[PDB]
Amino acid sequence: LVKEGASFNLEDSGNFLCTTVAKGDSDFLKRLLSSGMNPNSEDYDHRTPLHVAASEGLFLMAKMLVEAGASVISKDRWGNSPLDEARLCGNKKLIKLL
Amino acid sequence: LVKEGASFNLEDSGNFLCTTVAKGDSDFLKRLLSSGMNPNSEDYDHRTPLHVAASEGLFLMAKMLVEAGASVISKDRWGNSPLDEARLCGNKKLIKLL
Secondary structure, three states: OOOOOOOOOOOOHHHHHHHHHHHOOHHHHHHHHHHOOOOOOOOOOOOOHHHHHHHHOOOHHHHHHHOOOOOOOOOOOOOOOHHHHHHHHOOHHHHHHO | OOOOOOOOOOOOHHHHHHHHHHHOOHHHHHHHHHOOOOOOOOOOOOOOHHHHHHHHOOHHHHHHHHHHOOOOOOOOOOOOOHHHHHHHHOOHHHHHHO
């Protein structure tokens, strides 16, 4: 389906991507990556998925999100950078990856 | 379906609350909450639907949530209370309702 060229059509890119991040389905997320969806979508607002990634605790998918188009200084509607959540969680591996 | 007594009984209710608030469907969300679906539950990101309502600033559906049993005490993942979010919004009526 990616060889012919016909593309996907998200119902809500930001909402779906942040819901997938919150659910923490590694297989589903990597299959979405295999589909080639842009991880720049964050939420209906600008709530960065890296915030949820730091909240959960794991680091590999946070690195995957931030390394594909995502920005480390994204400002949500509140105005909070992912550095804020990274410091709040206290986990250092995600800090190094960011 | 209501007189049959059927509850929502879905794990995706939290996932759908945030999407409904984000979409802004007033009548649809009001009918959903008037049904067995319970607005008190948190979202995928442990987000209070009342907190997101305060962030958006829609007074009518926020009133519907607080009438249907949404708790101001329950907080978002960030730790901000829905009352704190209403204060951040700047709507005095929303603040007093919160």
